[PDB]
């Protein structure tokens, strides 16, 4: 939030943006948090062309 | 039917021969009748020389169609 004119708070938009140390340190921690993705086969097979697909349209 | 013996024997025996050499074996008393024989084996010859000579994606989704029948 920021204040402009009256004067109350305009909202912004916000990210999360890692610098370099960042991205090395946010990394080394949630290394393990990292998940199983117990379905099966053809389940992850699928996920992935529907990846390929999304990147072809991007 | 022996000689063809030595010749299927000796196509992979080993590439290499002088012609004297193919006369040795194959019990000619010929020169000429060894490119007579090596030409119907079809052995090119070289100056009394002759010589005897899928992706892996793939692969993967064929071991999965292949688990999941």
Same mark, same amino acid.
Request: glycine letters at 4%.
């Given at each position: 939030? #920021?204040?402009?004119?009256?004067?109350?708070?305009?909202?912004?938009?916000?990210? $999360?943006?890692?610098?370099?140390?960042?991205?090395?340190? #946010?990394?080394?921690?949630? &290394?393990? #948090? &990292?998940? +199983?993705?117990?379905?099966?086969?053809? $389940? &992850?097979?699928?996920? +992935?062309?529907?990846?390929?697909?999304?990147? +072809?349209?991007? | 039917? @022996?000689?063809?013996?030595?010749?299927? =024997?000796?196509?992979?025996?080993?590439? %290499?021969?002088?012609?004297?050499? @193919?006369?040795?074996?194959? %019990?000619?008393? =010929?020169?000429?009748?060894?490119?007579? %024989?090596?030409?119907?084996?079809?052995?090119?010859?070289?100056?009394?020389?002759?010589?005897?000579?899928? =992706? @892996?994606?793939?692969?993967?989704?064929?071991?999965? @169609?292949?688990?999941? =029948?």
């Amino acid at each position: 939030y #920021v204040a402009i004119e009256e004067k109350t708070f305009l909202h912004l938009p916000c990210t $999360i943006e890692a610098e370099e140390a960042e991205e090395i340190g #946010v990394e080394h921690l949630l &290394r393990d #948090v &990292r998940d +199983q993705a117990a379905g099966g086969l053809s $389940i &992850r097979l699928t996920n +992935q062309l529907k990846s390929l697909k999304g990147l +072809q349209s991007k | 039917a @022996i000689r063809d013996e030595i010749a299927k =024997n000796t196509e992979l025996s080993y590439d %290499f021969l002088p012609l004297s050499n @193919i006369k040795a074996l194959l %019990f000619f008393n =010929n020169e000429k009748e060894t490119e007579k %024989f090596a030409l119907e084996r079809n052995w090119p010859i070289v100056n009394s020389k002759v010589y005897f000579n899928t =992706n @892996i994606i793939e692969k993967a989704m064929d071991y999965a @169609i292949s688990i999941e =029948n």
